[model samples]
Target: SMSVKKPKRDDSKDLALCSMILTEMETHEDAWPFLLPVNLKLVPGYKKVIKKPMDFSTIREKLSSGQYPNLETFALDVRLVFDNCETFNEDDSDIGRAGHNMRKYFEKKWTDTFK
Candidate 1:
């Protein structure tokens, strides 16, 4: 049967989960580097390498601003911050370590919440 039922808010489940994830992410001890966009002057090559820069603050704004239609999309945006970190910093470096820790927390929480 071909169904055409639009998923209306889908029980607000994804929204609520995303909210929780963002809240914890913001409060995480390793969230310092990701709280805001990377400074271009500080990291001059950022724009050249990273086409789409994502951050915790911007993700929060987007979630509250209706930019995320589903957690799937929102997850990608969140993942981008970590991905950019991987590209720009060394794994043992401070910023790199934070991204790793933050990514671990994000993925674990996302799976735990959705499941």
Candidate 2:
């Protein structure tokens, strides 16, 4: 017989991180192109639907459309944005710094939310 696994507790930390990242993205227009691919990966069927040079509004709209199954999945995609940045670019550049800063901000905010 197969046993069922219970779902974990609901937590808002990652949701808040997503909100903060969206806000951060809003301010850094130049970073959109680099970050947009990460957002595209989160959407279902993105390979078939997404095109090059997409705008942030469309990315945001897709994110808000409940294409992802849960906040944890969403957060994983959000984290991947930073991972991609770190992997693909120099850490001292503006784009890399922006990604670093966003990660730091999210970490702090996530910690503060629980305290």
Candidate 3:
């Protein structure tokens, strides 16, 4: 069985997203809050978002409006899903691979939908 890639260090934004996602999942309802900044730094984009909130917000708004001008966020979201899925299913082996495949699927879907 292949292990997932380890998350990056100093990525508070990604870690916050990861924590929020875990909170959305019933499994970690009570644990997400406590898991903050401690592991938040381990997620990717902590520094990037801090450095580039304008760019991040631009992409975020487009995504929210259903016009995904930047596929990076789509890619990042799926990667985040896989990165933290173990919190939902520690025994599941396919989520990350599935997320990899889904990232491709979404990129295509975005192209088709927007172009």
Candidate 4:
């Protein structure tokens, strides 16, 4: 018979650092302008709408609710938002570059924090 191996748990300190970085990104005014104007669509009638992106708030709320099981998952969630922006602009716009840079900043900080 073979036994299953359990996955490693995330360090709380790492989670806290990620949360702090997200908060800092959310509060940065320059980051905001580049992060907004998300396209939204309502279900049922499928009404299209343009609105401000709430990625930070959503991620923060999820973090507070313990929705992320690991730092990698949380990082993926954060990246999805930025990735969407990049795709929205076909990867050739200022907003897209800003989003990419923001993601890079977080990634560097995350690596540094662990180091």
Candidate closest to the true structure, highest lDDT: 1
Question: Per-model C-alpha lDDT, please?
Answer: 0.91, 0.58, 0.40, 0.68
- lDDT agreement of model 2 with the native: 0.58
> Please, what are the lDDT tens digits per residue for candidate 2 over residues 1-115?
2687678766645555566666666566455434444455665554553333333354466567866565556555556656756765578888778778776765575456444
Minimum summed lDDT over a 10-residue window in model 3 is located at: 29-38
When summed lDDT is taken over every stretch of 10 residues in candidate 4, the lowest stretch is 43-52
Query: Clash totals for all models, in order?
Result: 0, 0, 1, 0
Runs of candidate 1 exceeding 4 Å displacement:
4-10
Cα-based RMSD of the predictions, in order?
2.3, 7.4, 16.0, 5.0
Model 4 off-target regions past 4 Å? 1-10, 33-54
TM-score of 2: 0.53
Q: Show the lowest summed lDDT stretch of 10 residues, model 2.
A: 49-58
- The TM-scores of all predictions, comma-separated, are 0.89, 0.53, 0.26, 0.69
Candidate 4: tens digits of C-alpha lDDT, residues 1-115 = 2687688665858768877888777776548734443434432221232122447667888889989887888888777777756655545676667777787887787787766
Clashes of 4: 0
lDDT of 3 by residue, 51-105 (tens): 2222223334444575643445544644454344434333344543443444454
lDDT comparing candidate 4 with the true structure: 0.68
Kindly indicate the candidate among 1 and 2 with the higher TM-score. 1
